[PDB]
Amino acid sequence: MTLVEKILSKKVGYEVCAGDSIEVEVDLAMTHDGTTPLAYKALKEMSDSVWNPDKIVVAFDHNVPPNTVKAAEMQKLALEFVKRFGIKNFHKGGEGICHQILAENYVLPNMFVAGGDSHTCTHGAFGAFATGFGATDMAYIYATGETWIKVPKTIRVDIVGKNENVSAKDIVLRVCKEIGRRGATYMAIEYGGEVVKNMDMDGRLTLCNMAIEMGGKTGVIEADEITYDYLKKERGLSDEDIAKLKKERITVNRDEANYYKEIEIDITDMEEQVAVPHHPDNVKPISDVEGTEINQVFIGSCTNGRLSDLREAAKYLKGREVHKDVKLIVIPASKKVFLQALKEGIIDIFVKAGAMICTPGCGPCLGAHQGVLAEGEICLSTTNRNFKGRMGHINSYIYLASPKIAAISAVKGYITNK
Amino acid sequence: MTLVEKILSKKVGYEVCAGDSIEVEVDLAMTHDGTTPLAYKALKEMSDSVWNPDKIVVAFDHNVPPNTVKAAEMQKLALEFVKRFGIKNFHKGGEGICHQILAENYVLPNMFVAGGDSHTCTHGAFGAFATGFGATDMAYIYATGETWIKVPKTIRVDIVGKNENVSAKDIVLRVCKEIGRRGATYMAIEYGGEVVKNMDMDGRLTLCNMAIEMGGKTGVIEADEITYDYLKKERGLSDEDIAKLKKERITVNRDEANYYKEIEIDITDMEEQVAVPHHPDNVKPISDVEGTEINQVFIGSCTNGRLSDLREAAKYLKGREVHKDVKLIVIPASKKVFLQALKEGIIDIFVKAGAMICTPGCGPCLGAHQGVLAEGEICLSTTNRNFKGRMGHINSYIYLASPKIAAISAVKGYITNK
Numbered sequence: 001m002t003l004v005e006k007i008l009s010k011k012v013g014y015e016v017c018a019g020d021s022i023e024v025e026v027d028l029a030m031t032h033d034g035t036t037p038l039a040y041k042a043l044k045e046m047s048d049s050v051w052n053p054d055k056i057v058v059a060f061d062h063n064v065p066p067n068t069v070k071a072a073e074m075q076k077l078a079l080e081f082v083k084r085f086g087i088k089n090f091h092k093g094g095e096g097i098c099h100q101i102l103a104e105n106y107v108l109p110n111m112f113v114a115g116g117d118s119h120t121c122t123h124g125a126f127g128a129f130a131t132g133f134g135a136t137d138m139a140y141i142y143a144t145g146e147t148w149i150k151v152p153k154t155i156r157v158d159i160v161g162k163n164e165n166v167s168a169k170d171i172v173l174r175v176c177k178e179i180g181r182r183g184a185t186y187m188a189i190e191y192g193g194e195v196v197k198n199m200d201m202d203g204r205l206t207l208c209n210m211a212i213e214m215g216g217k218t219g220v221i222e223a224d225e226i227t228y229d230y231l232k233k234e235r236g237l238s239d240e241d242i243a244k245l246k247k248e249r250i251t252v253n254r255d256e257a258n259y260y261k262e263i264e265i266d267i268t269d270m271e272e273q274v275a276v277p278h279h280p281d282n283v284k285p286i287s288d289v290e291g292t293e294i295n296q297v298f299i300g301s302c303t304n305g306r307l308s309d310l311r312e313a314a315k316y317l318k319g320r321e322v323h324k325d326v327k328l329i330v331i332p333a334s335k336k337v338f339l340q341a342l343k344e345g346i347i348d349i350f351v352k353a354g355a356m357i358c359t360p361g362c363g364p365c366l367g368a369h370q371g372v373l374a375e376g377e378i379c380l381s382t383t384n385r386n387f388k389g390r391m392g393h394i395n396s397y398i399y400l401a402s403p404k405i406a407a408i409s410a411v412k413g414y415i416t417n418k
Numbered sequence: 419m420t421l422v423e424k425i426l427s428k429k430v431g432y433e434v435c436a437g438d439s440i441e442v443e444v445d446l447a448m449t450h451d452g453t454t455p456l457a458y459k460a461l462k463e464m465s466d467s468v469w470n471p472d473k474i475v476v477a478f479d480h481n482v483p484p485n486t487v488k489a490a491e492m493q494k495l496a497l498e499f500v501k502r503f504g505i506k507n508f509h510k511g512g513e514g515i516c517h518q519i520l521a522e523n524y525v526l527p528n529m530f531v532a533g534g535d536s537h538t539c540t541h542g543a544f545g546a547f548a549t550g551f552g553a554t555d556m557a558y559i560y561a562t563g564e565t566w567i568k569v570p571k572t573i574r575v576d577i578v579g580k581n582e583n584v585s586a587k588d589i590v591l592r593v594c595k596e597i598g599r600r601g602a603t604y605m606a607i608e609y610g611g612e613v614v615k616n617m618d619m620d621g622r623l624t625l626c627n628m629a630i631e632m633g634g635k636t637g638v639i640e641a642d643e644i645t646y647d648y649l650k651k652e653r654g655l656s657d658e659d660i661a662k663l664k665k666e667r668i669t670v671n672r673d674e675a676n677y678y679k680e681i682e683i684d685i686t687d688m689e690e691q692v693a694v695p696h697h698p699d700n701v702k703p704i705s706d707v708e709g710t711e712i713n714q715v716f717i718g719s720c721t722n723g724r725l726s727d728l729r730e731a732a733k734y735l736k737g738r739e740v741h742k743d744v745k746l747i748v749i750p751a752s753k754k755v756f757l758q759a760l761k762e763g764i765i766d767i768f769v770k771a772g773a774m775i776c777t778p779g780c781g782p783c784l785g786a787h788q789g790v791l792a793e794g795e796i797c798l799s800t801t802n803r804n805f806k807g808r809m810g811h812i813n814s815y816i817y818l819a820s821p822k823i824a825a826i827s828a829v830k831g832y833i834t835n836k
Contacts (some may be wrong), residue, residue: 073790374490
């Protein structure tokens with residue numbers, strides 16, 4: 001029995017196998033400024049109320065503040081969803097990215113998280129089963145708190161070795177390379193090993209987030225002490241709640257689980273990994289892409305927008321200034337990350353370096369305004385998507401790398417390690 | 419002899435008066451990301467060189483970060499202009515508003531300041547003749563360093579009395595009524611009196627900024643010791659350099675200057691001012707619009723985006739949170755202003771209250787794709803424009819007020835004063 005089978009079995013109250021179709025109760029339902037309207041429209045035709053407003057989260061992160069009339073009409077319509085259904089857990093523009101809000105305030109281990117977003121798989125780092133759903137599907141979830149899901153197969157990814165010169169994004173890019181953009185199709189990506197157990201919670205959320213970029217239905221990491229300490233830090237979880245959570249802790253024994261595929265990654269010495277346009281799996285080491293001049297550098301997104309991502313980037317921008325031909329865009333993942341990075345003096349480092357700061361949202365990682373590339377512009381982003389013409393013009397280029405590389409490259413003006 | 423007549427005469431070398439068409443050598447030329455590519459493309463048809471790169475200033479502020487592909491293409495074209503002609507006085511995105519930057523490190527008294535912006539008249543607070551030109555005229559000036567204008571008539575505006583509950587925005591809004599939105603066309607505005615004399619440069623910048631809103635060709639304020647003190651705090655200093663500017667100081671004597679018309683504004687027992695849709699020449703006192711539901715509040719344009727404006731707004735926003743049904747947007751006018759407000763903890767108060775901090779520029783303005791309004795949505799702004807469908811939908815509404823009132827109304831969710 002794999003981890004996803006373990007979680008789902010405890011969820012329904014009986015042993016379940018991969019391939020089965022079971023009814024699962026939803027512990028956490030969420031839509032954002034882009035997926036709320038359609039979900040709301042469908043909900044009007046179906047129900048006059050929701051099943052539990054305390055388990056429903058709504059956040060504005062895609063178009064904040066409204067950059068178009070249409071986006072303004074979207075949030076306007078989403079505002080009525082909060083009103084007409086009495087949604088207490090509503091996060092306005094500036095609160096931050098939806099998944100970051102869910103992580104630092106809501107998601108508990110062994111939960112079944114249902115989200116109106118493709119990258120809902122991010123919250124599998126808590127030891128929960130989190131997948132994305134369509135707007136019509138989320139409507140029924142809002143009205144009943146239930147949904148049907150097929151227990152997916154599991155790809156075991158063992159990350160062993162030790163390398164302090166690389167970050168979690170460098171590792172997850174390495175995993176994307178060996179597996180591919182279609183390698184984990186219809187399958188949950190169960191991370192584990194020496195590195196994963198010693199990896200911080202900010203890093204675990206990075207690995208589970210890019211699960212969709214490998215075709216993965218979701219990503220999941222076993223609940224740990226780091227998971228519990230994170231729950232102690234970001235939220236006021238009492239010791240009675242940690243202990244209550246530890247008795248329900250789910251672990252996986254040896255050979256008690258049969259995986260579809262079991263890949264293993266040695267992290268040493270593996271220099272910093274960089275994804276090459278126009279696909280997330282096109283990952284090359286730093287030496288193979290050295291000297292590549294860039295026009296724009298973005299540091300934010302759900303993948304690397306947390307406090308630790310800004311802190312690392314701030315220590316390389318602490319001395320110098322952003323290159324003349326390079327524009328730096330910094331966007332904290334949430335309102336909490338923004339505040340904490342203010343008092344820490346992290347923001348001061350950025351602004352002095354000439355970095356452009358935007359309100360906590362999904363930045364220009366999508367469509368999206370707030371940082372559009374022109375024809376020919378190269379952007380070294382820290383997000384999780386390299387699709388051709390995603391950050392603007394169809395003939396623009398996007399590179400993916402850690403906040404460390406992004407910070408250093410912004411100074412030098414070219415992709416570098418020194 | 420009016421102030422404008424004295425400024426233009428010294429600049430040209432001989433005595434001129436209103437009605438005379440003269441050729442003036444330009445001391446300072448500036449275009450932003452929205453007008454630089456327009457002026458460059460126009461320059462590529464007639465000339466093949468700029469007259470003086472040192473006298474040319476380029477600053478990105480309107481669309482920072484790039485909101486559309488066309489906007490990104492424009493900024494790329496503007497980079498060509500700077501790279502080609504070696505414009506050392508170039509400011510990237512995040513540096514701040516074009517007029518604010520120009521006031522922080524360029525505009526000297528007695529100058530002739532030409533700008534590719536309808537609010538270049540702001541720099542008349544330094545005692546310099548400053549007007550706005552189109553893309554065509556900006557190319558002409560870029561090539562020859564000279565332009566052809568007609569010496570305007572002067573509507574003298576004496577502001578006397580005392581009031582410590584209103585602001586410079588409240589004052590300049592009072593001026594726009596007695597005069598009108600078209601009661602100063604083809605004419606220059608000359609502010610004087612005990613109030614203007616006691617104003618800091620933050621107040622004088624506001625008065626000269628709203629000159630075009632009255633149809634005025636420009637708004638100019640006589641330079642004094644307060645003007646020189648600002649040039650010490652900002653662009654470095656020297657008591658010998660200030661003395662070198664006082665030797666060229668231009669003063670105006672009463673009755674020795676014949677104006678087209680003279681107006682005097684009472685301020686002692688005046689209420690605070692809020693302009694109603696859809697024109698800047700429509701303010702009823704705060705008691706006449708108190709209770710008006712607002713859906714969005716913007717604080718921080720060229721009119722009211724400086725340090726004093728932020729600290730005043732943070733004062734009423736201190737400890738409180740922004741009302742639920744209204745989204746607050748705060749944008750510092752400059753990079754320098756941003757930094758000194760960060761070290762003062764002013765930004766923290768904004769973020770704690772739930773404001774949406776954006777890159778130091780001007781948005782939403784003319785639909786700059788920043789904080790776009792939807793249909794039936796009302797915004798209270800500290801900007802200078804009030805026209806129908808300015809911030810988005812044609813059926814949207816805009817109200818103009820001071821940062822003080824803007825902050826308070828953001829707290830209570832409606833236009834108020836308490």
